[PDB]
Coordinates of C-alpha atoms and ligand atoms in Angstrom, one line a residue:
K4 CA 43.8 -29.9 41.1
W5 CA 41.8 -28.2 43.8
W6 CA 38.8 -28.4 41.3
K7 CA 39.6 -32.2 41.0
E8 CA 39.2 -32.8 44.6
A9 CA 36.4 -30.6 45.0
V10 CA 32.4 -31.6 45.3
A11 CA 30.1 -29.0 43.8
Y12 CA 26.7 -28.0 44.4
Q13 CA 24.3 -26.5 41.6
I14 CA 21.8 -23.8 43.1
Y15 CA 18.8 -23.0 41.0
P16 CA 18.1 -19.6 43.0
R17 CA 14.8 -18.9 41.6
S18 CA 13.7 -22.0 43.8
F19 CA 16.5 -22.5 46.3
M20 CA 15.6 -20.1 49.3
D21 CA 12.9 -17.0 49.5
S22 CA 13.9 -14.5 52.3
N23 CA 11.1 -11.7 51.7
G24 CA 7.9 -13.5 50.7
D25 CA 7.2 -13.0 46.9
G26 CA 7.5 -16.5 46.6
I27 CA 10.8 -15.8 44.1
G28 CA 14.1 -17.5 45.5
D29 CA 16.9 -14.7 46.2
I30 CA 20.5 -14.1 47.1
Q31 CA 19.4 -13.1 50.6
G32 CA 18.1 -16.6 50.5
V33 CA 21.1 -18.5 49.5
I34 CA 22.9 -16.7 52.2
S35 CA 20.3 -17.8 55.0
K36 CA 21.4 -21.4 53.9
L37 CA 25.1 -21.6 53.7
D38 CA 25.4 -23.3 56.8
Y39 CA 23.5 -26.0 55.0
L40 CA 26.2 -26.3 52.3
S41 CA 28.9 -26.0 54.4
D42 CA 27.9 -28.8 56.6
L43 CA 27.2 -31.0 53.7
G44 CA 30.7 -30.8 53.1
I45 CA 30.4 -28.5 49.5
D46 CA 33.5 -27.2 48.1
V47 CA 32.4 -25.3 45.1
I48 CA 28.9 -23.6 44.7
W49 CA 27.4 -23.3 40.9
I50 CA 24.8 -20.7 40.9
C51 CA 22.5 -20.7 38.1
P52 CA 22.2 -17.1 36.2
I53 CA 21.5 -14.1 38.5
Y54 CA 22.0 -11.2 36.2
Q55 CA 19.3 -8.8 34.9
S56 CA 16.7 -10.4 32.8
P57 CA 13.2 -10.5 31.6
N58 CA 13.1 -14.3 32.8
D59 CA 11.7 -15.5 29.3
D60 CA 14.2 -18.4 30.1
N61 CA 14.6 -17.8 34.0
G62 CA 17.9 -16.1 33.9
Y63 CA 19.3 -17.4 30.8
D64 CA 18.1 -14.4 28.7
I65 CA 20.6 -11.7 30.1
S66 CA 19.7 -7.7 29.4
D67 CA 22.6 -6.6 31.4
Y68 CA 25.7 -8.7 32.2
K69 CA 27.2 -6.4 34.9
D70 CA 24.0 -5.8 36.8
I71 CA 22.2 -8.5 39.4
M72 CA 18.5 -9.6 38.6
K73 CA 16.2 -7.7 40.4
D74 CA 14.1 -10.6 42.0
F75 CA 17.2 -11.7 43.1
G76 CA 18.5 -8.6 44.8
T77 CA 21.4 -6.4 44.1
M78 CA 25.1 -6.2 43.5
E79 CA 26.0 -5.8 47.0
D80 CA 23.8 -8.7 47.9
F81 CA 25.9 -10.6 45.5
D82 CA 29.1 -9.2 47.1
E83 CA 28.0 -10.3 50.3
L84 CA 27.4 -13.6 49.0
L85 CA 30.7 -14.0 47.7
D86 CA 32.2 -13.2 50.9
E87 CA 30.3 -15.1 53.2
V88 CA 30.7 -18.0 50.7
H89 CA 34.9 -17.3 50.7
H90 CA 34.9 -17.2 54.5
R91 CA 33.2 -20.2 54.7
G92 CA 36.0 -22.0 52.7
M93 CA 33.7 -22.5 49.8
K94 CA 34.2 -21.4 46.1
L95 CA 31.6 -19.5 43.6
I96 CA 31.4 -20.1 39.9
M97 CA 28.9 -18.2 38.0
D98 CA 26.8 -19.3 35.0
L99 CA 28.3 -17.6 31.7
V100 CA 25.7 -17.3 29.3
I101 CA 27.3 -15.9 26.1
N102 CA 25.5 -17.8 23.2
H103 CA 22.9 -15.2 23.1
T104 CA 21.3 -12.2 25.2
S105 CA 18.1 -11.2 26.1
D106 CA 16.2 -9.1 23.2
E107 CA 16.1 -6.5 25.7
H108 CA 19.8 -6.1 26.2
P109 CA 20.7 -2.4 25.2
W110 CA 23.3 -4.2 21.9
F111 CA 20.2 -6.1 20.6
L112 CA 17.8 -2.8 21.1
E113 CA 20.7 -1.0 19.0
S114 CA 21.1 -4.0 16.7
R115 CA 17.3 -3.9 15.7
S116 CA 16.7 -0.1 15.7
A117 CA 17.9 0.2 12.2
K118 CA 18.9 -1.9 9.3
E119 CA 22.3 -0.1 9.5
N120 CA 23.6 0.7 13.0
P121 CA 27.1 -0.3 14.5
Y122 CA 25.9 -3.0 16.6
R123 CA 23.5 -4.5 13.6
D124 CA 26.3 -7.4 13.0
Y125 CA 26.6 -8.3 16.9
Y126 CA 23.5 -10.5 15.9
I127 CA 22.4 -13.0 13.4
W128 CA 20.3 -11.1 10.8
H129 CA 19.1 -12.5 7.7
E130 CA 16.6 -11.5 5.0
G131 CA 13.7 -14.3 4.2
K132 CA 13.6 -16.7 1.3
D133 CA 10.4 -17.1 -0.8
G134 CA 8.3 -15.0 1.6
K135 CA 9.5 -17.2 4.2
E136 CA 12.3 -17.7 7.0
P137 CA 16.1 -17.6 5.9
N138 CA 15.9 -21.5 6.1
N139 CA 14.1 -24.3 7.7
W140 CA 15.7 -24.3 11.0
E141 CA 13.8 -25.4 14.1
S142 CA 14.3 -23.7 17.6
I143 CA 15.3 -26.0 20.3
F144 CA 12.2 -24.4 22.0
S145 CA 10.2 -25.6 18.9
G146 CA 8.9 -23.2 16.3
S147 CA 11.2 -21.4 13.7
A148 CA 14.8 -20.7 14.7
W149 CA 14.2 -17.2 13.0
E150 CA 12.0 -14.2 14.4
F151 CA 11.0 -11.4 11.7
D152 CA 11.5 -8.0 12.7
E153 CA 8.9 -5.7 10.9
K154 CA 11.2 -2.4 11.1
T155 CA 14.1 -3.3 9.5
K156 CA 12.3 -6.4 7.4
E157 CA 14.9 -9.0 8.5
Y158 CA 14.9 -12.1 10.6
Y159 CA 16.9 -12.7 13.7
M160 CA 18.1 -16.3 14.4
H161 CA 17.0 -17.6 17.7
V162 CA 18.3 -21.3 18.6
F163 CA 16.7 -21.0 21.8
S164 CA 13.6 -18.5 22.7
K165 CA 12.3 -15.6 20.5
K166 CA 13.8 -13.4 23.3
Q167 CA 17.1 -14.8 23.1
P168 CA 18.8 -13.7 19.6
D169 CA 21.8 -15.4 19.2
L170 CA 25.6 -13.3 19.3
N171 CA 27.5 -13.1 16.3
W172 CA 30.9 -14.9 17.0
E173 CA 32.1 -14.1 13.9
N174 CA 32.2 -10.5 14.6
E175 CA 35.3 -9.3 16.4
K176 CA 34.0 -6.6 18.1
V177 CA 31.2 -9.0 19.8
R178 CA 33.9 -11.3 21.1
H179 CA 35.8 -8.5 22.4
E180 CA 33.2 -6.9 24.4
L181 CA 32.5 -10.7 25.9
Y182 CA 35.8 -11.1 26.7
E183 CA 36.0 -7.7 28.5
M184 CA 32.9 -8.5 30.7
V185 CA 34.3 -12.0 31.3
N186 CA 37.4 -10.6 32.9
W187 CA 35.4 -8.0 35.0
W188 CA 33.6 -10.5 36.8
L189 CA 36.8 -12.7 37.2
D190 CA 38.5 -9.3 38.8
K191 CA 36.1 -9.5 41.4
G192 CA 37.4 -12.8 42.4
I193 CA 35.0 -15.5 41.6
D194 CA 36.0 -19.0 41.1
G195 CA 35.3 -19.7 37.7
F196 CA 32.3 -20.4 35.3
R197 CA 29.9 -23.2 34.1
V198 CA 29.6 -22.0 30.6
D199 CA 26.4 -22.0 29.0
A200 CA 24.9 -23.7 25.5
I201 CA 28.9 -23.2 24.6
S202 CA 28.9 -26.0 22.1
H203 CA 26.3 -24.1 19.9
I204 CA 28.0 -20.6 19.3
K205 CA 29.5 -21.7 15.7
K206 CA 26.7 -21.7 13.2
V207 CA 27.4 -23.5 9.7
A208 CA 28.5 -20.4 7.4
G209 CA 25.4 -19.5 5.4
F210 CA 22.9 -20.9 7.3
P211 CA 21.9 -23.8 4.8
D212 CA 18.8 -25.5 4.7
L213 CA 18.7 -29.1 6.4
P214 CA 17.5 -32.2 4.8
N215 CA 13.9 -32.9 5.6
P216 CA 13.0 -36.4 5.1
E217 CA 9.7 -36.1 6.9
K218 CA 8.7 -32.8 5.6
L219 CA 8.5 -31.3 8.9
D220 CA 7.3 -27.5 9.5
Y221 CA 10.9 -26.9 10.7
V222 CA 13.8 -29.1 11.1
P223 CA 15.7 -30.0 14.4
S224 CA 18.9 -27.7 13.8
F225 CA 21.7 -29.3 15.8
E226 CA 23.8 -30.0 12.3
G227 CA 23.4 -26.4 11.8
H228 CA 24.9 -25.1 15.1
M229 CA 26.0 -27.7 17.7
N230 CA 29.8 -28.1 17.9
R231 CA 30.4 -27.2 14.2
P232 CA 34.0 -27.4 12.7
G233 CA 35.4 -24.0 13.2
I234 CA 34.3 -23.6 16.8
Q235 CA 37.5 -24.4 18.5
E236 CA 39.2 -21.4 17.0
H237 CA 36.5 -19.3 19.1
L238 CA 36.8 -21.6 22.0
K239 CA 40.6 -21.3 22.2
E240 CA 40.7 -17.4 21.7
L241 CA 38.1 -17.3 24.7
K242 CA 40.4 -19.7 26.7
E243 CA 43.5 -17.3 26.3
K244 CA 41.8 -14.0 26.5
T245 CA 40.0 -14.9 29.8
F246 CA 40.3 -18.1 31.8
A247 CA 43.9 -18.7 31.2
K248 CA 44.7 -15.6 33.0
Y249 CA 43.1 -16.8 36.2
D250 CA 43.5 -19.8 38.7
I251 CA 39.8 -20.6 38.3
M252 CA 37.8 -23.9 37.2
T253 CA 35.4 -24.0 33.9
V254 CA 33.0 -26.3 32.8
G255 CA 31.3 -26.1 29.6
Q256 CA 27.8 -27.4 28.9
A257 CA 28.8 -28.9 25.8
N258 CA 26.2 -30.9 23.9
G259 CA 27.2 -33.0 20.8
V260 CA 30.4 -33.7 22.1
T261 CA 31.0 -37.5 22.3
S262 CA 33.7 -39.4 24.2
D263 CA 35.9 -40.1 21.4
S264 CA 36.2 -36.2 20.4
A265 CA 36.7 -34.4 23.7
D266 CA 40.4 -34.0 23.2
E267 CA 40.1 -30.4 22.3
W268 CA 37.6 -29.7 25.4
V269 CA 39.1 -31.0 28.2
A270 CA 42.7 -32.5 27.7
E271 CA 45.2 -31.5 30.2
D272 CA 47.3 -29.6 27.5
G273 CA 45.4 -27.3 25.2
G274 CA 41.7 -28.4 26.2
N275 CA 39.5 -25.2 26.5
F276 CA 37.9 -26.4 29.9
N277 CA 38.9 -28.3 33.0
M278 CA 35.9 -30.2 31.9
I279 CA 32.5 -30.3 30.3
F280 CA 29.1 -31.5 31.1
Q281 CA 28.5 -34.0 28.3
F282 CA 24.9 -35.5 27.6
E283 CA 25.1 -38.8 26.1
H284 CA 24.2 -40.7 29.4
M285 CA 21.3 -38.3 29.7
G286 CA 19.2 -39.4 26.8
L287 CA 18.5 -43.1 27.3
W288 CA 14.5 -42.7 27.0
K294 CA 11.6 -48.6 30.9
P295 CA 13.5 -51.3 32.9
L296 CA 16.5 -48.5 32.4
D297 CA 19.4 -50.4 29.9
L298 CA 21.7 -50.5 32.2
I299 CA 24.5 -52.1 29.9
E300 CA 24.0 -49.1 27.6
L301 CA 24.4 -46.8 30.8
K302 CA 27.9 -48.7 31.6
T303 CA 29.2 -48.3 27.9
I304 CA 28.4 -44.7 27.9
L305 CA 30.1 -43.8 31.4
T306 CA 32.8 -46.6 30.3
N307 CA 33.5 -44.8 27.4
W308 CA 34.1 -41.5 29.2
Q309 CA 35.9 -42.7 32.2
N310 CA 38.7 -44.5 29.9
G311 CA 38.3 -42.1 27.3
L312 CA 39.3 -38.9 29.2
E313 CA 41.9 -40.9 31.4
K314 CA 43.8 -41.7 28.2
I315 CA 44.2 -38.1 27.2
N316 CA 44.7 -36.7 30.9
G317 CA 41.3 -35.1 31.0
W318 CA 38.7 -34.7 33.5
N319 CA 35.2 -36.0 33.9
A320 CA 32.3 -33.7 35.5
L321 CA 30.3 -36.1 37.1
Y322 CA 26.3 -35.9 37.2
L323 CA 22.9 -37.2 36.9
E324 CA 20.9 -34.1 37.7
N325 CA 20.3 -30.3 36.8
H326 CA 18.2 -27.7 36.1
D327 CA 17.4 -28.9 32.2
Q328 CA 16.7 -32.8 33.6
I329 CA 13.8 -34.4 35.2
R330 CA 14.9 -36.0 38.7
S331 CA 17.3 -38.6 38.9
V332 CA 15.1 -41.0 40.8
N333 CA 12.7 -40.8 38.2
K334 CA 15.3 -41.3 35.1
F335 CA 17.6 -44.1 36.5
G336 CA 15.9 -45.2 39.9
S337 CA 12.6 -46.4 41.2
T338 CA 9.7 -44.2 42.9
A339 CA 8.9 -47.9 44.2
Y340 CA 12.2 -47.9 45.8
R341 CA 13.0 -44.1 46.4
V342 CA 15.2 -43.8 49.4
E343 CA 17.3 -46.8 48.0
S344 CA 17.6 -46.3 44.6
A345 CA 18.9 -42.5 45.6
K346 CA 21.3 -43.7 47.5
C347 CA 22.4 -46.5 45.1
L348 CA 22.4 -43.6 42.3
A349 CA 24.5 -41.5 44.5
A350 CA 27.0 -44.0 45.0
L351 CA 27.1 -44.9 41.4
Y352 CA 27.6 -41.7 39.6
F353 CA 29.6 -39.7 42.6
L354 CA 32.2 -42.5 43.2
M355 CA 33.6 -42.6 39.3
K356 CA 36.9 -40.8 38.5
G357 CA 35.9 -36.9 38.0
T358 CA 34.6 -33.7 39.9
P359 CA 30.8 -34.5 41.1
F360 CA 28.2 -32.0 41.0
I361 CA 25.0 -32.3 43.3
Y362 CA 22.1 -30.5 42.0
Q363 CA 19.7 -29.1 44.4
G364 CA 17.2 -31.7 46.1
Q365 CA 19.2 -34.3 44.7
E366 CA 20.7 -35.3 47.9
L367 CA 17.1 -35.4 49.6
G368 CA 15.8 -37.8 46.7
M369 CA 13.3 -35.3 45.4
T370 CA 11.1 -36.7 42.6
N371 CA 9.0 -35.6 39.5
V372 CA 6.1 -33.8 40.2
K373 CA 2.7 -33.8 38.2
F374 CA 0.6 -30.6 37.7
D375 CA -2.6 -31.0 36.0
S376 CA -2.6 -27.5 34.3
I377 CA -0.3 -25.9 31.6
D378 CA -0.6 -22.9 33.7
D379 CA 1.0 -24.3 36.8
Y380 CA 4.2 -24.8 34.4
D381 CA 6.8 -22.4 33.2
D382 CA 9.6 -23.6 31.3
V383 CA 9.1 -21.7 27.9
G384 CA 10.2 -24.8 25.9
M385 CA 7.2 -26.9 27.1
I386 CA 5.1 -24.3 27.0
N387 CA 5.8 -23.9 23.4
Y388 CA 5.5 -27.4 22.6
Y389 CA 2.2 -27.5 24.8
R390 CA 0.7 -24.7 22.2
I391 CA 2.3 -26.1 18.8
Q392 CA 1.3 -29.6 19.4
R393 CA -2.5 -29.3 20.7
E394 CA -2.9 -27.1 17.3
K395 CA -1.5 -30.4 15.7
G396 CA -4.1 -32.4 17.2
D397 CA -2.6 -33.9 20.3
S398 CA -4.9 -34.3 23.5
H399 CA -4.0 -32.5 26.5
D400 CA -3.2 -35.8 28.2
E401 CA -0.9 -36.8 25.5
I402 CA 1.3 -33.4 25.8
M403 CA 0.9 -33.4 29.6
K404 CA 2.7 -36.9 29.5
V405 CA 5.4 -35.5 27.5
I406 CA 5.8 -32.7 30.2
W407 CA 5.5 -35.1 33.4
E408 CA 8.3 -37.7 32.0
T409 CA 10.5 -35.4 30.5
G410 CA 10.1 -31.6 31.4
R411 CA 12.7 -30.0 33.0
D412 CA 10.2 -28.1 35.3
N413 CA 10.3 -31.0 37.4
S414 CA 13.7 -29.9 38.7
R415 CA 12.6 -26.7 39.3
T416 CA 10.1 -27.0 42.4
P417 CA 11.0 -25.5 45.4
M418 CA 14.0 -26.9 47.4
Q419 CA 12.0 -28.7 50.3
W420 CA 13.4 -27.6 53.7
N421 CA 10.8 -28.7 55.8
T422 CA 7.4 -29.2 56.3
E423 CA 5.9 -25.7 57.3
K424 CA 4.0 -24.1 54.6
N425 CA 6.0 -24.3 51.1
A426 CA 8.4 -26.5 52.4
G427 CA 9.7 -23.7 54.2
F428 CA 11.0 -22.1 50.7
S429 CA 8.6 -19.0 51.0
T430 CA 6.3 -17.3 53.2
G431 CA 4.0 -16.3 50.2
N432 CA 2.9 -17.8 46.8
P433 CA 5.7 -19.8 45.4
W434 CA 6.5 -18.9 41.4
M435 CA 6.2 -22.3 41.1
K436 CA 4.4 -24.9 43.3
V437 CA 5.8 -27.3 45.6
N438 CA 6.0 -31.1 45.3
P439 CA 3.3 -32.1 47.8
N440 CA 5.5 -34.8 48.9
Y441 CA 7.4 -32.1 50.8
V442 CA 5.5 -33.3 53.9
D443 CA 7.5 -36.9 53.2
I444 CA 10.7 -35.6 51.7
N445 CA 12.8 -32.5 53.6
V446 CA 15.9 -31.3 54.8
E447 CA 14.6 -31.1 58.9
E448 CA 13.4 -34.7 58.4
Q449 CA 16.4 -36.0 56.8
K450 CA 19.1 -34.2 59.1
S451 CA 17.7 -36.2 61.9
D452 CA 17.8 -40.0 60.2
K453 CA 21.1 -41.0 60.3
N454 CA 20.1 -43.3 57.4
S455 CA 18.8 -40.3 55.0
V456 CA 19.8 -39.8 51.4
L457 CA 20.8 -36.3 52.8
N458 CA 23.2 -38.1 55.0
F459 CA 24.3 -40.5 52.8
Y460 CA 25.7 -37.8 50.3
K461 CA 27.2 -36.6 53.4
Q462 CA 29.1 -39.8 54.0
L463 CA 30.0 -39.9 50.3
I464 CA 31.7 -36.6 50.2
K465 CA 33.4 -37.5 53.5
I466 CA 35.1 -40.9 52.1
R467 CA 36.1 -39.2 49.0
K468 CA 37.9 -36.5 50.9
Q469 CA 39.2 -39.0 53.1
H470 CA 40.5 -41.5 50.4
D471 CA 42.6 -40.3 47.5
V472 CA 42.0 -43.9 45.3
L473 CA 38.0 -42.2 45.0
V474 CA 39.6 -39.1 43.5
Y475 CA 42.6 -40.1 41.7
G476 CA 42.2 -43.6 41.2
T477 CA 42.0 -45.4 37.8
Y478 CA 38.4 -47.0 36.9
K479 CA 37.8 -50.3 35.8
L480 CA 34.4 -51.3 34.6
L481 CA 33.6 -55.2 36.2
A482 CA 30.9 -57.5 35.4
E483 CA 30.0 -55.9 32.1
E484 CA 27.4 -58.1 31.1
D485 CA 25.1 -58.1 34.5
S486 CA 21.9 -56.4 33.3
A487 CA 21.4 -55.6 37.1
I488 CA 24.8 -55.0 38.7
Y489 CA 26.9 -52.2 38.2
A490 CA 30.0 -52.6 39.3
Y491 CA 33.4 -50.8 39.1
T492 CA 36.5 -50.5 40.9
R493 CA 39.0 -47.4 41.5
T494 CA 42.7 -48.5 41.9
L495 CA 45.3 -46.2 43.2
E496 CA 48.8 -47.8 44.0
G497 CA 48.5 -50.3 46.8
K498 CA 44.3 -49.6 47.6
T499 CA 41.4 -50.9 45.4
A500 CA 37.9 -49.4 46.1
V501 CA 35.1 -51.4 44.9
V502 CA 31.6 -50.3 44.1
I503 CA 28.8 -52.2 43.7
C504 CA 25.4 -51.0 42.9
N505 CA 22.6 -53.2 42.5
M506 CA 20.8 -51.2 39.8
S507 CA 17.2 -53.2 39.7
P508 CA 14.1 -53.0 41.8
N509 CA 14.9 -56.6 42.7
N510 CA 17.0 -59.2 45.0
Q511 CA 20.2 -60.2 43.2
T512 CA 22.8 -62.7 43.9
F513 CA 26.4 -61.5 42.9
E514 CA 30.0 -62.9 43.2
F515 CA 32.4 -60.6 44.7
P516 CA 34.7 -59.7 42.0
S517 CA 37.8 -60.4 44.3
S520 CA 44.1 -61.0 46.8
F521 CA 44.0 -58.3 49.8
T522 CA 45.4 -58.0 53.2
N523 CA 42.6 -55.9 54.4
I524 CA 38.8 -55.0 53.5
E525 CA 36.7 -52.2 54.9
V526 CA 33.2 -51.2 53.9
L527 CA 33.4 -47.6 53.6
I528 CA 29.6 -47.2 53.0
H529 CA 26.5 -49.3 52.6
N530 CA 22.7 -48.3 52.2
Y531 CA 21.4 -51.5 53.6
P532 CA 22.1 -53.0 57.1
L533 CA 24.7 -55.4 56.7
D534 CA 23.6 -59.2 57.0
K535 CA 25.2 -61.3 59.9
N536 CA 25.4 -64.5 58.2
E537 CA 26.4 -63.1 54.8
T538 CA 29.4 -64.5 53.4
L539 CA 31.8 -61.8 51.0
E540 CA 32.1 -63.8 48.2
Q541 CA 28.3 -64.3 47.8
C542 CA 26.7 -60.9 47.8
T543 CA 22.8 -61.2 48.3
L544 CA 22.0 -57.5 47.5
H545 CA 18.3 -55.7 48.1
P546 CA 16.7 -53.6 45.7
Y547 CA 19.1 -50.8 44.7
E548 CA 21.5 -52.1 47.5
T549 CA 25.0 -50.3 47.4
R550 CA 28.3 -51.3 48.8
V551 CA 31.6 -49.9 48.6
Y552 CA 34.6 -51.9 50.1
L553 CA 38.1 -50.5 50.5
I554 CA 40.4 -53.2 49.6
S555 CA 44.5 -53.1 50.4
Ligands
LIG1 O1 20.5 -20.6 27.7 C1 19.7 -21.3 27.1 C2 19.6 -22.9 27.5 O2 21.0 -23.4 27.5 C3 21.3 -24.3 28.3 O3 20.5 -25.9 27.8 C4 20.5 -26.0 26.3 C5 21.8 -27.1 25.8 O4 23.0 -26.1 25.8 C6 21.5 -27.3 24.5 O5 22.7 -28.0 23.7 C7 20.0 -28.2 24.6 O6 20.1 -29.2 25.1 C8 19.3 -30.0 25.4 C9 18.7 -30.8 23.7 O7 18.1 -29.9 23.1 C10 18.1 -32.3 24.0 O8 18.2 -33.0 22.6 C11 18.6 -33.1 25.0 O9 19.9 -33.4 24.9 O10 18.6 -32.4 26.5 C12 19.4 -31.3 26.2 C13 19.2 -30.5 27.9 O11 18.0 -29.7 27.8 O12 18.9 -27.6 24.8 C14 19.4 -26.8 26.3 C15 17.9 -26.0 26.8 O13 16.8 -27.1 26.9 C16 20.8 -24.1 29.5 O14 21.3 -25.0 30.6 C17 19.2 -24.1 29.6 O15 19.0 -23.7 31.1 C18 18.9 -22.7 28.7 O16 17.4 -22.7 28.6
CA2 CA1 12.1 -13.5 47.3
CA3 CA1 35.1 -16.1 11.3
CA4 CA1 22.1 -59.8 52.0

C-alpha cells in the first residue's frame, strides 16, 4: 500500500549526472542531485542497471550481478547512495535483469568453453539446421536470434544482442543461482525491483520455426518467447523464493500482456508482481488517435479494478521516444507536456516519471549514425542500408522511433553540456537545453517542473486521486480526454484537451462544493463552468464534493 501511494522516478544513470568529467553519468552524480528528487516529492527511485557490464546494451548485459559497473563507481558508492536515499525519506528499487547475461559473464565463459561442461545448460544451445541457424527466429535487435560458436560448433540463443545470451530457465540450477542472487540484493535493504524483459523467459519447447508469409531472412519471434504458456510456473516460483519474503515493491516489464490477461501478473491474490509495465498504449504509430488511447487506458483501468490489481502509470522510459513528441505537440511543447502529465498521472495507479519528462524534454536529431549508440538502431542501420534503404530513410526511423531520444543528458542548466558534465558527454546533449532546463524551470512558477511538483502534491493531499474509481467521460470526443476519480463523497474531474486547438466542452456535471486543484492556463474571468472554452492542450482538474 505504501507502493500504491508512491510516486516513482526513473533514473538512467549513464545520462543523469557526471561527477568526475569523463562524460559518463555515475553514482556520485546521482547522490549530488538527491535534493532535486526529494524536493520534487518523489517517493521511490528506480535506477536502471548499475552492475558490471561491457555496455553492449548499456547495463542490460551484465557480467557480474554483485559488482558495480566501473563507469558508475564502486559498491561503496552504491552503499552511500542507498543510505542517503533512505535518510531522505525515499526508497530505491533496482533493475533485475535475469532473462539474459553478458556473454562475458563467468557462467557463459564457462558455458561456451566446451560442448560438455557443468554450465553448458545455463544457456540455450542448439546445433544448426541445414547448414544454417537452428530456426528462423529474428533477434529483437535485428538479425538472427542465434549466434554460432566456432569452438563447440553450436548456436546460442539471444533474443536481444549477440552479447546477451539468454539464460535457460528450464534448468533448475540456473533458477536456484538466480534466486540466491536476488535475495542477496534484498538482504541489503533495497526496496524492490523493476524486473527486466520478464515476459521473455519462457521459450516454446523445441524452438520451432515460425510462419514466414513475407519470406523474410529472419522472422520477428515474439510468438516463440513472449508471454508463452508455462511462464507462470517460473514466475510463481520466483515470487515464492524471493519477493514474497520481503516487504518490497515489484514492477515487471511485461510486453505481450493485455488487460484481459493480466490476472496472473498483478492480481492482489496470486499475482506475481505488484504491477507491470504494459505496452499497449506505447505502440500507436499523426493526429494521435485519441479515442484508441482512451480505449486502451480505460481497458486497463477497468480491467485491473475488477481483479484488484494495480496499474503502473507511465508515458516515458529509456526504451521510448519523448512523450511530447509521441503523445503531445512540439508546437505546444510546455502546454502539451502539462496536459500529458495531468492525463496519465491522475489515473488510478502508481505513476512513474522518467528523467527529463518533468521538464518537457523532446526528441533530438543527430545527422551521423556515429552520434547514436543504441545497439538496436545501429544494427537496424547496418542491415537496412545493405538492403538498399537510403541514409535519410533510416535516419527517419531512428529520429522518429529510436530510444536514444530518451537517453540524451539530463538538462540541469545552461552551462556547458547543460551542466551534465565538464567533459565530453557519451551521448550529445539536446541543443534545446538552452531553453529547457531545471534551473530555468525552478524559478518559473508555471514551468513543466513545477506542474509535476503540484501534481505530486495534490495526489498526496487527496485520497480520491490515489484510491478513487476511474470512469471515462465523453468517450466519443476526438479532442477531449476527460475522466473522473470517485471516492466516497469526493469526485475529481480531470479534463484534458488533447489537441493543438481551442475546443468547447460541456462540463460533465450535483455538488455542494467545487475547487480547481490544478490548471495549466490562467483562468478566464467570464468563463462559465458549464461551457468550457479550452485552449490548445489545456488541462484542468476539479474537485467536487
Ligand atoms: O535487456 C534487454 C532489453 O530489455 C528491455 O526492453 C525490451 C522488452 O522487454 C521487450 O519486450 C521488447 O520491447 C519492445 C518491443 O520489441 C517493440 O515491439 C515495442 O513494443 O517496444 C518495446 C520497447 O522497446 O524489447 C525491449 C528492448 O527494446 C529493457 O527495458 C531494454 O532497455 C533492454 O535493451
Ligand atoms: Ca563520470
Ligand atoms: Ca521445465
Ligand atoms: Ca476559455
